[PDB]
């Protein structure tokens, strides 16, 4: 850790210096009211980008939060296979992956994995 943090800072300093060189090495010209205008294919923009952007994969978005938190429970598997009771480890692991598949196929069949339409 403490080694990694030091190099993490050292890299961040180095990368930071890079633009601090770029900001000075960059040619400097007077900024225009149009030069800094946004790019939207050369025609002025109708709509701010900060309007509410509708969402259609919201349902998947929530399911993503869940499925990760079961990744927290499969990852330890390997580490404790040499040390655990094989029946308990075998049984539980399987009924862990079957539960996941059944959940997935259930929603897939119910059509929730499809986007809002």
């Amino acid at each position: 850790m403490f080694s990694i943090i030091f190099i993490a800072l050292l890299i961040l300093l180095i990368t930071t210096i890079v633009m601090f060189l770029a900001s000075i090495l960059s040619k400097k010209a007077l900024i225009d009211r149009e030069k800094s205008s946004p790019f939207e294919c050369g025609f002025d923009p109708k709509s701010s980008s900060r309007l509410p952007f509708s969402l259609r994969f919201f349902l998947i978005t929530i399911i993503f939060l869940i499925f990760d938190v079961e990744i927290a429970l499969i990852l330890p598997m390997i580490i404790i296979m040499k040390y655990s009771n094989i029946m308990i480890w075998t049984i539980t692991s399987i009924i862990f992956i079957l539960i996941l598949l059944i959940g997935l196929y259930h929603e897939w069949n119910q059509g929730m994995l499809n986007w809002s339409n």
Partner: protein
């Protein structure tokens, strides 16, 4: 005291979490933002206590599973909020 040198900091952080959960911000999401802030601090203390035990840290996974579900459920209720009120502002709800 022992509790002041070792357990004070997380508790002071926890109450600051709650004071976020009650302050007046327009958007409901401000509650969700502060929700997993508190959970982050609960993990920190729980992880202090579990480590007083030599090998009991496995229960951290149990706690995290319930952390996401309340956040995940908290996010679902917000979705259902939108499709009846159209917006998530607190002041938009009937005061009762």
């Amino acid at each position: 005291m022992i509790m002041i040198l070792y357990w004070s900091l997380p508790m002071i952080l926890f109450i600051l979490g709650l004071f976020c959960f009650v302050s007046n911000r327009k958007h409901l999401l401000s509650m969700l933002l502060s929700l997993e802030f508190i959970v982050l601090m609960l993990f920190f203390m729980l992880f202090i206590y579990l480590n007083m035990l030599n090998y009991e840290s496995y229960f951290s996974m149990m706690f995290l599973t319930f952390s996401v579900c309340e956040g995940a459920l908290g996010l679902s209720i917000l979705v259902s909020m939108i499709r009846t009120h159209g917006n998530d502002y607190f002041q938009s709800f009937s005061i009762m």
